[PDB]
Design a protein around this ligand. Structure first.
Ligand SMILES: *Cc1c(COP(=O)(O)O)cnc(C)c1O
Ligand SMILES: *Cc1c(COP(=O)(O)O)cnc(C)c1O
Lengths: 423, 423
């Protein structure tokens, strides 16, 4: 008998504890200070960040800041007490659902209290052990966690690969008639890691051959792809091909909560069956009011999406002009691929921050093979072109030191929060 | 092959759709309007509700409403953009963690974005397929969903029964030595349905005969039980016996989010491993700010808890005086058990609302067996004794008509929202 605490204590605490030791406050859990935007303060110094997922610049929008301040003053954050079924239902929650459904072009929408929870329970509600899933290998964690709720069969197809898909689809369809069940395909509109867009058009094209249901997570696509920001589905003209459309307020909408879209009969079922919404609190009113304003601005200002993509093409082409390796990305997500070890990537970053005033996260060995280094650059419509130029310039300096072994000469910096204790 | 949409379109949509047709807006998704409190408006009429779980009356506390309004004005509702590990970490999140851990008397706390997914992931990283879980049969849905992620063995013990417990620990410990793993017990501090309390003091006494770890969901106990509202653990004086203490802001705290408490080494492990925290947005600042005020008020005002329990004892004893059945509740939860069918329960409630101005939910046949009718009465420190007397009076009238047979003479009322469409 290995006691649970004992195993987690040292046997599990030791390997990842080293990362915590030197990263807490700097490489993990940084503390950005100030109003939300490209220009914030880190550790006493003003900096230019590319780490926020706020694509449309709505976070510090004066109109958004008013609506947020006004809704909280009127309703407080106590807001609709209790779950939506029990006591937390308001006409404002229903107005936002009507406007969201109208925007993305489906019958109905259900305002969710949180994205991660919502996904877990849509996957829970759609699936029965008879049915069979086919999901993209790069699926977000909430999709994976929702899939672990399923006692049925699951088939994983290689990332955005229509050959493994069509292939695994045949295994699903074979198992589906044997088990007397249906088949469900889950992919994303915009994959946040590599930045590539889900090939939705080629996936609905496969609906001619295999007879399936399609679930799409457009968390990174809403406000950013398609007509006026309507998302990746609109971008491919497949809004009718996607049966269930999931979306979150975290990324473009600069906020909290989520919504799922589809036909009225199904959204109503989800209303009465989604455990994560039956048995947890309703989305607060201040968010509801603020989301109403945010959705108003996205509708009224299609310029925000344009300006974002102007920064996207400028940054992406500018980086590719100077031999920087941007991944296979058709979205604003701009990851910069490089080579090096932990002491190189760590020292690289403190050079970018303490010397060039550039703030970005890095993806390193715990996630990506040792030797790989990804700078995660996320352009927002709040960025300027001076921002783009300064960053590419500072990136160019930083690369010369990396390729010239200068960072390999230095040890891992010690920049963790003073006072942080691992035990 | 049964298409997933067809399995739910008419086959799964038919039975519960009738409930939706007549309940939506009245019995299913009521729209309480006004400031949060015992006296709000429903369908044009002012009413006295017992439906919100704001035990300490903090929701509309002026100091709380200022803190909420002030934090939103300063930070907006987007203020911690991105997940906590990436960009959403703030010193205010860490202040609230330090104050919460100090209150409930554990080493460390991790502020979560939402209780439901928080639980799903604390169960996630606590367990491996070798370990074995013993959980109370009445566990909340998020606990159930949480251990559906567990690919190992699970043993369910009968509600608050220390004999069916011991038998399953014996089965667990036996399987734990064969599988070379540990044991974990999950129960609740206050069970929200029947109102009865978890026998925590006894549960930790079983730690003499078996070596397990204990996880407790105090969602209904915080602010409500124990010294100054410290919760059910403090109420039994077994805070040291609870290894992992989960809690939510949705009930007494009158808000959004949650927190888990325990030793620093574990809370740090959870900080770096909880999927629902790594891969979802951080708790907004206005809530952080507000939660700091709410925790200040709880510490500074221990009569909020006493005023609550004065209303509890008055209401419960008054109902027991008049032969109403309150059940086995130890907590503020006051469920009133009665007998009847759906047309009786529904017309009972219409009478309570449209004639007596009393707002409460009912639990009906899909969940509890046909025959029982429980009114869910939730007392709150904002309730008056006049509130208690009027309700018991109205309850006494309503009961004479129920046992008399008047309600059985009427059909199921039609009171759903005009405009709601089932499909
Ligand atoms: C309220 C509730 C939760 C969830 O809290 P939320 O923050 O609303 O998700 C978890 N467990 C229990 C017992 C609850 O009553
Ligand atoms: C951020 C994210 C979510 C979750 O959004 P939250 O509201 O923060 O929980 C879900 N799916 C994807 C792809 C995401 O990037």
């Amino acid at each position: 008998m290995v006691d649970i605490f004992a195993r987690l204590e040292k046997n599990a605490g030791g390997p990842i504890g080293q990362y915590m030791s030197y990263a807490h406050g700097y490489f993990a859990f940084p503390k950005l200070e100030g109003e939300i935007g490209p220009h914030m303060v880190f550790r006493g110094k003003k900096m230019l960040n590319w780490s926020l997922n706020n694509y449309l610049g709505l976070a510090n929008h004066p109109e958004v800041r008013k609506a947020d301040a006004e809704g909280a003053a009127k309703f407080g954050m106590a807001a609709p007490m209790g779950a939506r079924m029990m006591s937390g239902q308001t006409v404002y929650h229903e107005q936002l659902e009507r406007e969201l459904a109208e925007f993305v072009g489906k019958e109905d929408a259900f305002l969710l209290n949180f994205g991660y929870q919502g996904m877990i329970s849509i996957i829970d509600c759609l699936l029965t052990p008879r049915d069979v899933v086919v999901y993209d290998a790069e699926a977000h964690a909430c999709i994976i966690d929702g899939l672990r709720l399923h006692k049925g069969k699951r088939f994983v197809y290689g990332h955005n690969d229509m050959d493994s898909l069509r292939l695994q689809l045949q295994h699903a369809t074979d198992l589906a008639e044997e088990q007397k069940g249906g088949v469900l395909v889950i992919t994303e509109g915009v994959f946040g890691m590599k930045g590539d867009l889900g090939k939705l058009d080629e996936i609905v094209a496969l609906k001619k051959d295999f007879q399936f249901r399609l679930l799409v997570d457009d968390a990174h696509g809403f406000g950013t792809m398609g007509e006026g920001g309507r998302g990746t589905a609109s971008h491919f003209g497949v809004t009718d091909g996607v049966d269930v459309l999931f979306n979150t307020f975290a990324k473009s909408m600069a906020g909290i909560g989520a919504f799922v879209c589809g036909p009225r009969w199904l959204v109503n079922l989800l209303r009465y069956n989604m455990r994560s919404q039956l048995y947890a609190k309703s989305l607060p009113m201040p968010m509801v009011m603020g989301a109403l304003k945010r959705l108003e601005l996205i509708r009224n200002h299609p310029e925000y999406q344009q300006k974002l993509w102007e920064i996207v093409r400028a940054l992406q082409n500018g980086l590719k002009e100077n031999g920087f390796e941007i991944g296979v990305t058709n979205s604003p997500v701009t990851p910069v691929f490089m080579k090096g070890g932990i002491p190189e990537a760590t020292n690289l970053i403190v050079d970018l921050r303490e010397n060039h005033g550039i703030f970005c996260s890095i993806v390193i060995y715990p996630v990506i093979p040792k030797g790989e280094i990804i700078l995660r650059v996320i352009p927002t419509a709040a960025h300027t072109l001076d921002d783009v130029n300064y960053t590419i310039a500072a990136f160019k300096s930083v690369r010369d030191k990396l390729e010239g072994g200068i960072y390999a000469q230095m040890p891992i910096p010690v920049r963790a929060d003073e006072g942080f204790k691992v035990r």
